[PDB]
Amino acid sequence: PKALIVYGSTTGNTEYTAETIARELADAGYEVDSRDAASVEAGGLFEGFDLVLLGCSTWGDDSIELQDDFIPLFDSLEETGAQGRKVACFGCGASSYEYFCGAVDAIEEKLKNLGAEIVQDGLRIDGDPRAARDDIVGWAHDVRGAI
Numbered sequence: 001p002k003a004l005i006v007y008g009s010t011t012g013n014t015e016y017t018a019e020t021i022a023r024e025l026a027d028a029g030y031e032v033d034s035r036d037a038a039s040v041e042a043g044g045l046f047e048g049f050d051l052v053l054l055g056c057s058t059w060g061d062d063s064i065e066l067q068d069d070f071i072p073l074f075d076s077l078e079e080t081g082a083q084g085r086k087v088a089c090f091g092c093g094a095s096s097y098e099y100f101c102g103a104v105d106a107i108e109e110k111l112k113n114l115g116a117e118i119v120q121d122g123l124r125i126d127g128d129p130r131a132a133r134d135d136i137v138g139w140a141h142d143v144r145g146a147i
């Protein structure tokens with residue numbers, strides 16, 4: 001299968017999660033294209049992919065704000081070709097906050113409204129992702145079994 005991973009990361013935690021997920025998928029034989037949201041054009045972005053994984057950290061002071069580089073893509077998500085596309089979301093946040101990983105919920109809700117097929121509920125990491133390696137690995141295994 002061919003998967004696309006697009007991540008929005010300010011301090012590199014969601015980028016480290018995206019790289020862990022990319023290796024799990026490549027180790028199982030998938031074809032994997034991993035891109036920073038900062039380098040991406042929304043226009044037909046998901047075209048030709050069997051699975052699309054979107055990663056984004058949460059910002060703002062209990063007023064959800066998406067990671068800076070991901071904003072433009074979220075704004076033009078209606079142009080990516082998400083209708084009928086198998087997708088799943090992930091991101092890093094702080095479980096202590098009002099909207100823990102609220103950017104993962106917001107992205108899932110728009111994808112749902114755009115006709116995408118959410119194959120798995122979003123992976124929401126608390127704290128340092130390097131300490132949540134087994135959950136990341138376990139979530140990537142489950143998405144593979146869900147497509």
Ligand SMILES: Cc1cc2nc3c(=O)[nH]c(=O)nc-3n(C[C@H](O)[C@H](O)[C@H](O)COP(=O)(O)O)c2cc1C
Pocket residue numbers: 008009010011012013014015056057058059060061062063064067092093094095097098099100101102127
């Ligand atoms: C100023 C500020 C606001 C934040 N807002 C939230 C929030 O509303 N909810 C949440 O779950 N995490 C929030 N975070 C936590 C960050 O999303 C978290 O540190 C995450 O690991 C950052 O990931 P990144 O390095 O991929 O950009 C906030 C952090 C800062 C510094």
